[PDB]
Amino acid sequence: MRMFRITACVPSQTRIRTQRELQNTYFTKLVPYDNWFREQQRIMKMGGKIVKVELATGRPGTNAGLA
Amino acid sequence: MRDAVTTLIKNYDLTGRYLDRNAMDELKAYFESGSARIAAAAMINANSATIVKRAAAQLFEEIPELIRPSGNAYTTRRFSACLRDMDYYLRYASYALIAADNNVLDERVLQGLRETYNSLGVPIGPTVRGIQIMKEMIEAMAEDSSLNSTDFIASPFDHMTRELSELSV
Amino acid sequence: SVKASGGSSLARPQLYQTVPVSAISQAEQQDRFLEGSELNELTAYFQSG
Amino acid sequence: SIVTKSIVNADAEARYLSPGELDRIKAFVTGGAARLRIAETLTGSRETIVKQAGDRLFQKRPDIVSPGGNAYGEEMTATCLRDMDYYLRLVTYGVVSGDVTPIEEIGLVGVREMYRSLGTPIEAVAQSVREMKEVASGLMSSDDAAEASAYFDFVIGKMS
Amino acid sequence: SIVTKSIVNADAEARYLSPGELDRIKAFVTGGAARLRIAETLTGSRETIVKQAGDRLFQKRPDIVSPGGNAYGEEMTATCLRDMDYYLRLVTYGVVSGDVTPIEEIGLVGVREMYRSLGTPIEAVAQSVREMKEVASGLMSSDDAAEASAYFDFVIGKMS
Amino acid sequence: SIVTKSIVNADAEARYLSPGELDRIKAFVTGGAARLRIAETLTGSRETIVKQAGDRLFQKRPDIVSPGGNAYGEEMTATCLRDMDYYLRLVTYGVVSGDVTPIEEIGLVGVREMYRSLGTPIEAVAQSVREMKEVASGLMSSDDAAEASAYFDFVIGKMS
Amino acid sequence: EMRAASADYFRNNAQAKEIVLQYFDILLSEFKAPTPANKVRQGPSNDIQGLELPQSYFNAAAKRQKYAMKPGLSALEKNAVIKAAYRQIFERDITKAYSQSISYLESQVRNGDISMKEFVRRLAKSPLYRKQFFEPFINSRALELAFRHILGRGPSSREEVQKYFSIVSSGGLPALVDALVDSQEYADYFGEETVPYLRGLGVEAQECRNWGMQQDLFSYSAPFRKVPQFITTFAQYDRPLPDQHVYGSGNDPLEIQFGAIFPKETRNPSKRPAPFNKDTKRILIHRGPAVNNQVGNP
Amino acid sequence: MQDAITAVINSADVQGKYLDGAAMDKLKSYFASGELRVRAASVISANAATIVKEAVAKSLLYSDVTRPGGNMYTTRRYAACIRDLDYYLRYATYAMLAGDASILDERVLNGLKETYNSLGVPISSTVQAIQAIKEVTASLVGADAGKEMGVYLDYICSGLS
Amino acid sequence: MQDAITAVINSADVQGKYLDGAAMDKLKSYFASGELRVRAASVISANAATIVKEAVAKSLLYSDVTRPGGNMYTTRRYAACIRDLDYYLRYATYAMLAGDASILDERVLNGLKETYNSLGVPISSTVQAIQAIKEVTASLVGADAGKEMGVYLDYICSGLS
Amino acid sequence: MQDAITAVINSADVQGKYLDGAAMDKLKSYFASGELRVRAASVISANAATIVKEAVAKSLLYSDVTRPGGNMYTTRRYAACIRDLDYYLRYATYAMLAGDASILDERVLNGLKETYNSLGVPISSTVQAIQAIKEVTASLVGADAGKEMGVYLDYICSGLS
Ligand SMILES: *[C@@H](C)[C@H]1/C(=C/c2[nH]c(/C=C3N=C(/C=C4\NC(=O)C(CC)=C4C)C(C)=C\3CCC(=O)O)c(CCC(=O)O)c2C)NC(=O)[C@@H]1C
Ligand SMILES: *[C@@H](C)[C@H]1/C(=C/c2[nH]c(/C=C3N=C(/C=C4\NC(=O)C(CC)=C4C)C(C)=C\3CCC(=O)O)c(CCC(=O)O)c2C)NC(=O)[C@@H]1C
Ligand SMILES: *[C@H](C)[C@H]1/C(=C/c2[nH]c(/C=C3N=C(/C=C4\NC(=O)C(CC)=C4C)C(C)=C\3CCC(=O)O)c(CCC(=O)O)c2C)NC(=O)[C@@H]1C
Ligand SMILES: *[C@H](C)[C@H]1/C(=C/c2[nH]c(/C=C3N=C(/C=C4\NC(=O)C(CC)=C4C)C(C)=C\3CCC(=O)O)c(CCC(=O)O)c2C)NC(=O)[C@@H]1C
């Protein structure tokens, strides 16, 4: 299954108001290609910046055998 | 939630009717009241925290035991929680005044109030007493202010009283 | 009033924390027997009791 | 309702209504008079609006009414006109409420699935609503025609 | 370790160390002298303890040393004694740390599958740890041996 | 079975079974006669298989029936034979179903924890299953022996 | 003055009086401290209401232990984090009680290839969870359980239940899992490295609309009430009083020829309490002619 | 329902076995404790109304429950609360005599939580009332009979919760 | 949950007074029993698996429960019953150290009846197993510590009943 | 993470050797300093707000970052900065109680440097704030605890650098 290796930082927007424990907003992730669009859109809407992304698993332009 | 316009629309759509003369009349009444609704909401927003603080400072004198031992606001923690509930009541009453309908009141306030308060052991009578105290303060302040129309303000608080109040009779 | 009800069940918020409550809570939350650290807490607190 | 949207947005942040939301509410209240005027004209003209839109649609798209089309037959044509009447009523609801929430809630959720089940061309339905838009906009001033065009275009977009 | 567990709990709860945690840390520091004396005695008597445990284990479970078992000749017996010495050293580390954390970190997790792969009976190794426990308890004073037994039986139960 | 597994996957994806699953189900259904026949073979030979496997296992491993062994004693030995019969029955169930899911759900989930609480050596249990597989292969033809040994080795590997 | 009086009066030993000194210092520091800002739980969307809670309530409610899978965590705390994740996603320690686990995903989470969010996403759609909390349940009940397993809470609104039922209808269990994980609320409350936790009464502000619902959901008996307690009550709020005995749904016997067959309050929980006041006559369908009903034909 | 004797008999019957040594031992234990239970039952039956009175007085008098607006404000509501307390006292006494808690589940707990949730009855308040009932009954009944009575009252409270 | 300390403090506070004459007596008794209870808890934690093993051997093993058709038949069901016994022992230890079964009420008894009634777990067999666990723990820890744990274990048994 | 005891145990275990004289006296030193570390940690926890307030006052108040244009200007940015400093103080206290600096790398130095680089956070001002925290904590705890705390504070500042 083709998957993306993404490096992104997503600083919180409601930590001050909610008073919750901090988490490292910078992370490297192996995200499925199916969920990658939703994950990237959520990251952009959250306000964080994705610094690096790549297709870790899979061959570019593959027509069959995605799964 | 549904305001007056949306509840009228839903009511007419139930029968599958076009908006008739009575619908236009009710809409006109709400739209003309909207100025006073916005005015009252602005005033309550201006004096919100003071209103709740004064309402508590009257309610704990009406029923003094809520701050003495075995009372439900005994700690500062309990006191702050009680004032938070009072602030919630005021904010949702303001929302209901602007919306001209108590369904926004019901969906977000009353639908489980007795269950939650019984589970926490909170009294269900002193809370409505404080609600009425807030309503009295709000309407007195509105009457003092230059609010031509103020009758609608008693509707949300009185609906809260009727819903969350035990059926004595 | 309301035309339904979720159902009222008793809630038990903790008013404040004591050492025994803290240790028991940690062990119960982690699904463990009281280990050496919690046992030392309990013993020292009982001695100073 | 715009009032509904503003109150919900304020409640989501758990604060009292912001001055911007209050300004939006006041503007909506002020424009309520024009809203009632547009809605009243639409409801008064509902018969002629539906009839002229149906005539234009059945001239532009004879396939839907020709044999083999979904609306073919007297009963099917009457049902198509009834759907047009439903959507005109929804447009009046949206006009009164100042937004498209009633239109979405009543007649724009799962409409694609419903009309696929019924075998109807959703593009044809959108064309019918578009013609209703043109006919209704012919019956009012420039400002009110553009005002109702918003609801008509929203229905068109949701149907296509 | 007790301090490791305290730090872990503090991080999980998002706060500093309470009075109870500080008191237990202080008590652990005070008992560190006794636990270090325990470790000193164990490290002094390690060789005799391991030798007696090995011979008692061979007497009790001849199948390990007999044909068909893991103990053949001298090299297999040497490997078994090396594993026994490793377990004794891990018990000493647990005693010095006042907590089973060092024992688990060095070896307690995956021991079951490791011995399953090696063919060494986990019940037999747990038994051998047992006889190490009784030999150490006999070597040292009864009351002082309770703390060492508190970790020996832990390892035995984990391997049981 | 394969039918249950495919239906579960289709339900989880909220869809009908694909033809690539339907044809597999058809092939499984068609090739059921051989599985059934192996089933009657094993069930007919259950007593002899259990007896021979237990005899071979006890000959290979004397500590099990030796003093201090898990199966030491009359009732203990009878219970070990009962466990062997249990696993033979589960293997027959799996053979008939053409899948290992019945075995895994019935007598394979938590087996490690159960036998650890009982004190029984799971490796010895796996050895008993291996002896049972050898006896079954001896009593079965070359193809049938391999097919049954598939389930037998699955059980053995899951045990250890 | 109180502190000085206590110190002078007692003055026994530092081991006996340093405690008094420390506690009076804590008292003075807390008194000097300004009032803390109240925690605010924003409404996740338009459907749910925002909430607030004093930051004194969130100081005594036995705060949850939060586990974050940092990349460098040693084996012991990494194992603890994995066990916490297993307990959160399965209501218990399935790996410890049955040796059921996925070492394949465990290794990836341990080295950091897939962080906590993707671990949860894969685990929830794994067959292990699909056989325990989706396969044995209706779609509605499975969705309600999936909220607490993934979102640390229950359904908050009729609209939320409606949307997620539509999602699970379209894409099934994987679609529901994706919609839960790739949501603003999840990333807000847990980010990418925090295992989800149950935000109970003391963890945050609890809306007074799903009180009994979430109280019943959080308890370990949740997977045994098979009847959806969320959609039913959310519909019943908008609808009027139901056809039901005054004292509860369990108080209506079956209408069979004989036998007092009652729904047992503890077996397969199906209690449906309703606010019945005194003067609430019931509607009963007359066996004979409808005109013969004594309500209208006394 | 079922007493301890009934429980032993039912277990032996369901296993299809005669009363073995362990069943005899349990029966002997119940017979040993029987005189205590009879004494406690007689005491509580003699003082049924009083214990309820001081339970309410220590628990519910001059409180938000008895104020206007509470669930125990009106005279009819006070009578209903008293009837609830008398049921709980009577059935706890029955369970104490029988040595078993099956009766409470059969009669009281089988629908009582749903009943209070439909009624709006404050279960926290009723738990407090029964908890006070614990000590009020214990004072009259002694220490060990008090322990048994507290066991059954805790049973009622846990069922309510 | 609550322990003896917070129960005493809550009672004193609700009465509005300090810890005058009996709250401190109960607290000092609690502290006196605390170290022995901690030792008992340590022993129980060390021998947890052994205790469950002996209890299962005494009561459940070689019975219709373990035989086919019984609720403890399959391997998963056996493991679940073992884990339940471990839960019983651990929460009994928590209750013993706390001095109040409030932890048992809120974390164990809250839905224990519902879960066993829904699944089909034999209540009688479970109570027999818990009695065996209590007997084994009493044998392994002493008569005094045995009773101290047995009060809470029997509380769990009564709640199950 | 690890501590002094854990680190010495690991050092012995890597060569597979028992605790020698060096490990023995290092453990002696750790146990001797345990009381000092506990006292310093208790004082820091009691006065946690004070160190943050004083370090902020003497480090970044009336500065360019507080001026508009820097990362310290806005109220939300100021709150985030003070919360970050408070977590830094808490983890420094954790490290000082542990006796080992692995905790800061475990939880703090994992990605804070690169994430501040991503967000444009002033690293030099962060180091200055950490240093001011060093003097504040040294003054509050004493030279003996002050140097011990400043060791981990310098560790954090170097990791940020
Ligand atoms: C040879 C088989 C090994 C062996 C066996 C042995 N088993 C027991 C006791 C039990 N075994 C089981 C196992 C199961 N029951 C099931 O239903 C399933 C799935 C079908 C399994 C795996 C159980 C439940 C018991 C408990 C006894 C009972 O039936 O009630 C014993 C006796 C243990 C004791 O001390 O009583 C023995 C000896 N022993 C060996 O050494 C062989 C490796
Ligand atoms: C011996 C113990 C008896 C027995 C046990 C048995 N229990 C289950 C299943 C469950 N038991 C519980 C109970 C609890 N879980 C908790 O977390 C708590 C408090 C810590 C309690 C009291 C639960 C929740 C379950 C189901 C979910 C789970 O897996 O834990 C079973 C399984 C029955 C089945 O067929 O599924 C069994 C067998 N069975 C007996 O016969 C003994 C009398
Ligand atoms: C104060 C000394 C400096 C400063 C602070 C500052 N920080 C942020 C944003 C974040 N800081 C953190 C903190 C942590 N991340 C971790 O991994 C750890 C340990 C787990 C900690 C303590 C995080 C997570 C963020 C992102 C937002 C969030 O709260 O999750 C900001 C905000 C920057 C922005 O404009 O968005 C600021 C201002 N700023 C300075 O100028 C000081 C030098
Ligand atoms: C002023 C010199 C003294 C004083 C007077 C005062 N108090 C109140 C009101 C309240 N005081 C409390 C007290 C407490 N809450 C707690 O949790 C604790 C336990 C440590 C205490 C001592 C509370 C709950 C209230 C609110 C209810 C009430 O009206 O009493 C007032 C009235 C304020 C007003 O009218 O708004 C006054 C004048 N309090 C002190 O601490 C000083 C000794």
Ligand SMILES: *[C@H](C)[C@H]1/C(=C/c2[nH]c(/C=C3N=C(/C=C4\NC(=O)C(CC)=C4C)C(C)=C\3CCC(=O)O)c(CCC(=O)O)c2C)NC(=O)[C@@H]1C
């Ligand atoms: C004050 C007038 C009375 C009072 C209040 C009191 N309330 C609580 C606790 C809660 N109150 C609520 C209520 C609501 N939550 C909502 O979302 C809504 C609508 C927006 C309402 C009305 C809830 C849910 C709780 C518990 C959860 C929470 O607060 O987040 C307390 C706490 C009691 C205690 O001991 O903890 C108190 C004291 N008490 C009085 O005496 C007044 C009559």
Ligand SMILES: *[C@H](C)[C@H]1/C(=C/c2[nH]c(/C=C3N=C(/C=C4\NC(=O)C(CC)=C4C)C(C)=C\3CCC(=O)O)c(CCC(=O)O)c2C)NC(=O)[C@@H]1C
């Ligand atoms: C064995 C031949 C060599 C060896 C092994 C060894 N590996 C680790 C740790 C890890 N190994 C992996 C690798 C994988 N995990 C996967 O899921 C897959 C793909 C499906 C692979 C290839 C990972 C991820 C780790 C990290 C820890 C984890 O549990 O995942 C160790 C221990 C490392 C440690 O720091 O503790 C060891 C010892 N060691 C040798 O000497 C052999 C050459």
Ligand SMILES: *[C@H](C)[C@H]1/C(=C/c2[nH]c(/C=C3N=C(/C=C4\NC(=O)C(CC)=C4C)C(C)=C\3CCC(=O)O)c(CCC(=O)O)c2C)NC(=O)[C@@H]1C
């Ligand atoms: C169609 C033949 C009849 C009909 C249907 C109808 N259903 C709903 C709403 C829901 N239906 C369900 C059903 C299920 N959920 C499950 O999990 C299962 C099995 C997997 C079933 C069968 C649910 C849960 C809902 C709620 C949907 C939601 O989002 O709330 C409606 C709409 C009801 C409403 O809008 O309030 C309708 C119309 N209605 C008829 O008249 C037909 C006879």
Ligand SMILES: *[C@H](C)[C@H]1/C(=C/c2[nH]c(/C=C3N=C(/C=C4\NC(=O)C(CC)=C4C)C(C)=C\3CCC(=O)O)c(CCC(=O)O)c2C)NC(=O)[C@@H]1C
């Ligand atoms: C016999 C083939 C099986 C069987 C029977 C069995 N039934 C009961 C108890 C009851 N049976 C009924 C059934 C009905 N009530 C009706 O109104 C009708 C509709 C025509 C039917 C079929 C009821 C209500 C009961 C309750 C008890 C009563 O008689 O009132 C029992 C005994 C239950 C008990 O514990 O008392 C039994 C044994 N049992 C088997 O094993 C057979 C497979």
Ligand SMILES: *[C@H](C)[C@H]1/C(=C/c2[nH]c(/C=C3N=C(/C=C4\NC(=O)C(CC)=C4C)C(C)=C\3CCC(=O)O)c(CCC(=O)O)c2C)NC(=O)[C@@H]1C
């Ligand atoms: C007429 C407008 C619609 C209609 C009516 C219809 N009703 C029935 C049967 C019953 N109607 C009721 C209703 C009530 N009983 C009450 O006490 C009250 C509240 C005070 C109401 C609203 C009841 C209970 C019945 C059942 C018989 C009984 O009265 O006891 C029928 C007959 C159904 C049958 O199969 O016999 C009909 C036809 N039918 C329509 O099409 C109209 C829309």
Ligand SMILES: *[C@H](C)[C@H]1/C(=C/c2[nH]c(/C=C3N=C(/C=C4\NC(=O)C(CC)=C4C)C(C)=C\3CCC(=O)O)c(CCC(=O)O)c2C)NC(=O)[C@@H]1C
């Ligand atoms: C006075 C004419 C007689 C009398 C009075 C008396 N009453 C009580 C106690 C209570 N009285 C009531 C009655 C009511 N509460 C209500 O809400 C209603 C309707 C509005 C009624 C009728 C109640 C509930 C109590 C309990 C206390 C409380 O409510 O908090 C007492 C004291 C009893 C005691 O021991 O505490 C007394 C003395 N006594 C006489 O002799 C007169 C004949």
Ligand SMILES: *[C@H](C)[C@H]1/C(=C/c2[nH]c(/C=C3N=C(/C=C4\NC(=O)C(CC)=C4C)C(C)=C\3CCC(=O)O)c(CCC(=O)O)c2C)NC(=O)[C@@H]1C
């Ligand atoms: C005046 C109404 C009150 C007052 C003033 C006062 N302020 C400070 C210190 C600071 N005030 C600010 C201001 C802001 N921070 C923000 O984020 C924003 C919003 C965008 C503003 C307006 C800041 C940044 C500081 C600290 C840094 C600095 O000085 O620039 C003090 C100093 C107190 C001290 O002890 O040094 C004071 C006195 N004092 C009052 O009494 C009034 C209520």
